[PDB]
Design a protein around this ligand. Structure first.
Ligand code: RR8
Ligand code: CA
Ligand code: NA
Lengths: 234, 44
């Protein structure tokens, strides 16, 4: 996360971190239930083997609440391709169930039509992760969050070198130096409605990080609510 | 529903809620059935 702030205790409980063989975080995820994590399909390519860590807020300190989970099944969307980055979504079924507690709780999945008309129309959403704090810099050792404005689809297409599909949405800022970045990929983009946070996007890609004239691109979760439901029912 | 979300706490005139919640008596608010309902930040 470039800009933004560190999440306070209990503020981003649905954050999950995918860790590679080197025990280093490389992508985020969103807790959906005690057995499932939502992440980006492209993240599955970045580490031959990986595990999932929940409850962590500081990767340099082991604190109460952190726990590691092995992945039992990976369900990657069959239409994902790096050629377009379209359909950038995967669901992970964990071998053992997550115990919800302080800093570990699922984000809510909204109903499709309602989300389309009521959540996606809000002014902003919140993105979080342990990714780079600058395009060319190091990944954050602390969990960060950032409020990102929804960006008009047409404005986004005009700004983008690549095709923005209906399975994607844009958010962030034109020139303000705040954005998600590499390492945050796969992580949550949630939108608050009254007092409940609904997962609305999956950090997917961007041309650089916080670049002037560029936005953050997210997988639009509403386009895949049925796919997620079917995936979660094995 | 196009107005004040039908006065609904969550989904919308008929209000409904996400898993882990139960529609309250007033038929608008949503009540968590557990200590860690989805979408709620946690507190000690
Ligand atoms: C320089 S970096 O710090 O090492 N890093 C930052 C970029 C990032 O991810 N930022 C980022 C910024 C904001 C958010 Cl929300 C997520 C990621 C990342 C990248 O590679 N992005 C990227 C760019 C384009 C596509 N794409 C899109 C369509 C078609 C084909 C195609 O390849 C796919 C991508 F993976 C490289
Ligand atoms: Ca830690
Ligand atoms: Na920008």
């Amino acid at each position: 996360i470039v800009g933004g702030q560190e999440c306070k205790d209990g503020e981003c409980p649905w954050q999950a971190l995918l860790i590679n063989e080197e025990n280093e975080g490389f992508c985020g995820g969103t807790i959906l239930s005690e057995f499932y994590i939502l992440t980006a399909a492209h993240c599955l390519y970045q580490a031959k083997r990986f595990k999932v860590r929940v409850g962590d807020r500081n990767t340099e300190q082991e604190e109460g609440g952190e726990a590691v989970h092995e992945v039992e099944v990976v369900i990657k969307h069959n239409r994902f391709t790096k050629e377009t980055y379209d359909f950038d979504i995967a669901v992970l079924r964990l071998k053992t169930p997550i115990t919800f507690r302080m800093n570990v709780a699922p984000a809510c999945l909204p109903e499709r039509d309602w989300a389309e008309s009521t959540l996606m129309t809000q002014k902003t959403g919140i993105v979080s992760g342990f990714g780079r704090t600058h395009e060319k810099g190091r990944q954050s050792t602390r969990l960060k969050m950032l409020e990102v404005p929804y960006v008009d689809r047409n404005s986004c297409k005009l700004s983008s070198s690549f095709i923005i599909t209906q399975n994607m949405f844009c958010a962030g800022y034109d020139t303000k130096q705040e954005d998600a970045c590499q390492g945050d990929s796969g992580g949550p983009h949630v939108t608050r409605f009254k007092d409940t946070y609904f997962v609305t996007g999956i950090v997917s890609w961007g041309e650089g990080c916080a670049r002037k004239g560029k936005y953050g691109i997210y997988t639009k979760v509403t386009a895949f609510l049925k796919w997620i439901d079917r995936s979660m029912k094995t | 529903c196009s107005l004040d979300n039908g006065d609904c706490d969550q989904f919308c005139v008929v209000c409904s809620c996400a898993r882990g919640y139960t529609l309250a008596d007033n038929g608008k608010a949503c009540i968590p059935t557990g200590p860690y309902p989805c979408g709620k930040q946690t507190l000690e």
